[PDB]
Design a protein around this ligand. Structure first.
Ligand SMILES: [Cl-]
Ligand SMILES: [Cl-]
Length: 264
């Protein structure tokens, strides 16, 4: 059995929020032939004076997963999940908010910006490592990115390159508003983060980060897109599949060519 820490809420109070996420995990479970055992962890237990108690629970897991979530509930705990993963070489997979907390985590604990945050959770931060792009913004509000988008895999040695069968461009679907702040790419890179996929291969101020990795570690990957929006039992999301593979301590044969479901 493969123990995965699922960092968000208890089953009781999740509703149907993780319906598609759990479907994807199930596609993967079948493709890999592994007994998945998800630990549903309340992210708020990973913050405060007692958090070492919750951290211990994560250390006994084979993988640590942070899904998309809503509001600012448990952001510091989700960052703390990413920290445990990074410091202990426990496979990590983050989706949307899961990628944002990997960035915030790294900014606080390695870059040394104690006040690093997303603009979403702390408008007063002097290190808004995640923020709304200027081109998306109004005086009244900002774009809600939904739908399909070209994703450029820009690091040939990355997890992304591998799991998408060396395709240079793939197509994934979105639901987000805030992007990684392009002004801090150097600092993130210096701190060990690889920007492995982007919307714009020239890395301008309009370059939207689609995937980050930490190649010092066995498996540390976080994506902006929601991979669970494209997954079937026969064609599971490669991102989720590779995470579960790493957690199970198993290999997997990637196809010679990326499935057409994720190509233009
Ligand atoms: Cl949560
Ligand atoms: Cl891998």
């Amino acid at each position: 059995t493969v123990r995965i820490a699922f960092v968000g809420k208890y089953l009781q109070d999740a509703g149907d929020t993780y319906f598609s996420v759990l479907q994807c995990f199930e596609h993967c479970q079948i493709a890999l032939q592994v007994r998945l055992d998800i630990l549903y962890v309340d992210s708020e237990e990973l913050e405060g004076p007692n958090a070492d108690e919750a951290r211990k629970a994560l250390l006994g897991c084979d993988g640590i997963f942070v899904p998309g979530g809503f509001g600012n509930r448990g952001v510091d705990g989700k960052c703390a999940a990413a920290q445990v993963a990074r410091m202990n070489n426990i496979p990590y997979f983050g989706v949307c908010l899961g990628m944002q907390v990997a960035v915030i985590e790294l900014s606080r604990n390695v870059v040394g910006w104690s006040d690093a945050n997303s603009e979403e959770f702390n408008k007063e931060s002097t290190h808004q490592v995640v923020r709304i792009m200027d081109c998306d913004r109004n005086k009244m509000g900002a774009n809600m990115h939904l739908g399909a988008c070209d994703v450029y895999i820009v690091e040939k040695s990355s997890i992304m390159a591998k799991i998408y069968s060396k395709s240079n461009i793939v197509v994934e679907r979105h639901r987000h508003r805030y992007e990684v702040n392009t002004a801090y790419f150097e600092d993130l890179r210096k701190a060990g983060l690889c920007i492995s996929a982007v919307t714009d291969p020239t890395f301008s101020s309009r370059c939207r980060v689609e995937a980050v990795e930490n190649p010092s570690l066995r498996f540390f990957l976080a994506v902006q897109f929601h991979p669970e929006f494209i997954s079937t039992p026969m064609d599971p999301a490669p991102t989720y599949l590779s995470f579960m593979a790493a957690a199970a301590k198993k290999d997997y044969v990637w196809p010679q060519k990326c499935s057409q479901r994720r190509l233009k």
